[PDB]
C-alpha cells in the first residue's frame with residue numbers, strides 16, 4: 001500500500017539523449033536510429049529569437065554547423081530537414097541503444113513522465129499531466145529545451161512531448177512530429193496560457209485510490225446523477241463528466257464496490273464544504289494528476 | 302471585388318485519391334509515393350464496430366485481404382502497419398501524380414479545403430474551419446470516410462485532416478499521423494462534441510473584408526481597449542482577443558485605415574444591438590470561417 005507520484009523508469013530514454021549545438025545555442029536532442037530530433041529554435045541567435053523566419057535560417061546552414069555530442073563521442077551530421085517545429089538531423093551512426101518506440105500525441109488529462117536534461121545529460125525524472133489548457137506544470141531551468149516526455153507500454157516507449165519553452169511559470173512544447181500542444185508558437189510574442197480547469201475523472205480516480213488505501217471519511221450514503229453533478233462541477237471550474245469517464249472508472253468501482261455516481265456524491269460534498277482540515281492520501285487539496293490507469297497500475301500492480 | 306467561400310483548386314489532391322476495401326468495408330484512401338493512408342476502422346466488420354481491439358484485428362490480416370483500386374488499376378499491397386488511428390498500406394507502385402506535400406496539424410480557427418470523396422471518386426470541394434471544440438461543420442454522407450482536408454502553399458499541398466466519423470450532425474477526424482482532433486475515439490461510445498464558441502479574430506477579418514468591398518454602415522467613431530471588449534465578448538460566447546490576434550490583423554488595418562480596436566468598437570455594438578435587418582457581405586449573421594489570411598488572399602490576391 002501507499003500512494004506516490006510515480007514516474008516510469010527512465011533507463012530506455014536516458015540512452016537516447018544527446019547534446020546539440022549550433023553556433024552558441026546548445027540544447028538537448030533525442031537520438032533514435034540514425035536521426036537526432038531537437039527543437040528547431042536551436043538554429044536561432046539573439047538577433048532572430050523574437051520573429052525568426054526558420055526557412056530562411058535553415059537555408060543558410062550546412063551540416064557542419066551542427067555539433068552533436070553523445071557524451072564524448074561526436075556524431076557526424078550528414079543531412080538535415082525541418083518538420084513543423086522540430087529539426088531532424090540525419091547522422092552517420094544509428095544509436096545502438098534505440099528502444100522499441102513510437103510517436104503518440106496525448107490528450108489533456110493524460111499523464112506522462114518527463115526526463116529533464118541539461119547539456120544532453122539526464123538530471124531528473126518526474127510525472128506530470130497535460131493540463132486542459134495544453135500546458136504542463138513542469139520543473140525546468142534554462143538549458144532544458146529538447147527534454148522529452150514519455151510513457152512505457154510493455155517494452156515500447158511512447159514519446160509524447162518535447163519541451164520548447166516556459167510561459168509565465170508553466171511549460172509548453174510539441175509532440176515529436178513538431179506540432180505544438182495548444183495555441184503557441186516557437187518565438188517570443190505576447191502569448192499566455194488560457195484558463196485552466198480541474199480534471200474531474202482524475203480527481204475521482206484519486207478518491208478511489210484513497211478508499212483502497214483506507215481513507216474513507218469522505219464517503220456518504222447519497223447518490224446523484226451526471227446532470228446534477230455537472231451542474232455543481234461547472235460552478236467550481238471542473239471539467240464535465242461524461243458516460244465514457246464513468247465507464248473508464250469501472251474497474252475501480254468494481255474493486256471497491258463504490259459506484260461512480262456514489263463517489264460523485266462524495267465529490268459534490270467535498271466541493272461544497274471543503275475538507276475542513278482533514279487530508280486525503282496526505283494532501284489537503286483534491287489532486288487531479290493521477291489517471292484511472294495510473295491508480296490501477298499503482299494499486300493493483 | 303465580391304467575396305465568396307472560396308476553396309483551393311483540388312487537382313493535385315484528386316490524383317491521390319483511391320478506394321480501399323477490406324472484406325465488406327470500403328472507404329477512401331490517400332496514395333502518396335508508395336504508401337496508401339486510410340482510417341484504420343476499415344479493418345472492422347459490424348461485430349467489432351462498437352469496441353474493437355485494432356491490434357488484434359490487424360494481426361489476423363494479410364496483405365491480400367486489402368483491395369486498393371486506383372480507378373480501375375488494382376494496386377498490390379506488399380506490407381501494412383498501423384500508426385495511431387490510420388493504416389499505412391505499402392504498395393508496389395509509387396503514385397506518379399504525387400505532388401510536393403507535407404503533413405501539418407492545424408489549430409482551431411484555421412480554415413482548409415475538403416475534397417469529399419465516395420468509392421475513391423472525388424465528388425465536391427468546400428472550405429471549412431476547424432471549430433474551437435475540434436469538430437468541423439462539414440457536409441458528408443455515408444462512404445466519405447478517408448476524405449481529406451488540405452491547404453496549398455505555393456506548389457506544396459499541406460494535408461491536415463482525414464475524415465473518420467459524424468457525431469450528432471458534425472464531423473470529427475485526425476491529422477495524417479493518425480492523431481484525433483479533439484477528445485474522440487474511432488469506435489462507437491457516448492461521445493459528443495463540447496460547447497462551441499465564435500472565432501473572434503475571424504469575425505474581425507470578415508468585417509475588414511466588408512469595408513474593402515464597400516459595406517461601411519456598421520462603423521462608428523468610438524474606440525475601446527482589449528479588456529472592455531473581451532468582457533463583452535465573453536458574455537456572447539466569443540473567443541477572447543489577444544495582442545497576437547491584433548497583430549495578425551495588421552495588414553487589413555493598414556489597407557483600410559481602420560484600427561483594430563476601432564473595429565472592435567463596431568463589433569461590440571453589433572453584438573449588443575444586432576444588425577436589425579441589415580446585411581454584411583450578403584449575410585445576416587456574423588461570419589467566423591474566414592481567416593485574416595483568407596481575406597488577404599481573396600481581397601488583394
Ligand SMILES: Cn1cnc(Cn2c(=O)nc(Nc3cc4cn(C)nc4cc3Cl)n(Cc3cc(F)c(F)cc3F)c2=O)n1
Pocket residue numbers: 024025026027039041042140141142143144145164165166185186187188
Ligand atoms: C526557465 N526555463 C524553463 N524552461 C525553459 C526552456 N527554455 C530554454 O531552455 N532555453 C530557451 N532559450 C535558449 C536560450 C539560450 C542561451 N544559450 C546560450 N543557448 C540557448 C538555447 C535556448 Cl533554447 N528558452 C526560451 C525559448 C525557447 C524556444 F524554443 C522558443 F521557441 C522560444 C523561447 F523563448 C526556454 O524557454 N527555460
Ligand SMILES: Cn1cnc(Cn2c(=O)nc(Nc3cc4cn(C)nc4cc3Cl)n(Cc3cc(F)c(F)cc3F)c2=O)n1
Pocket residue numbers: 325326327328340342343441442443444445446465466467486487488489
Ligand atoms: C453520415 N456520415 C457522415 N460522415 C460519415 C462518415 N462515416 C462513414 O462514411 N462510414 C462509417 N462507417 C462505415 C460503414 C460502412 C458500411 N460499409 C459497407 N462499409 C462501411 C465503412 C464505414 Cl467506414 N461511419 C461510422 C464510423 C466511422 C469510423 F471511422 C469510426 F471510427 C466510427 C464510426 F462509427 C462514418 O462516420 N457518415
Ligand code: NA
Pocket residue numbers: 219220221222223262263265266
Ligand atoms: Na455517496
Ligand code: NA
Pocket residue numbers: 520521522523524563564566567
Ligand atoms: Na469605431
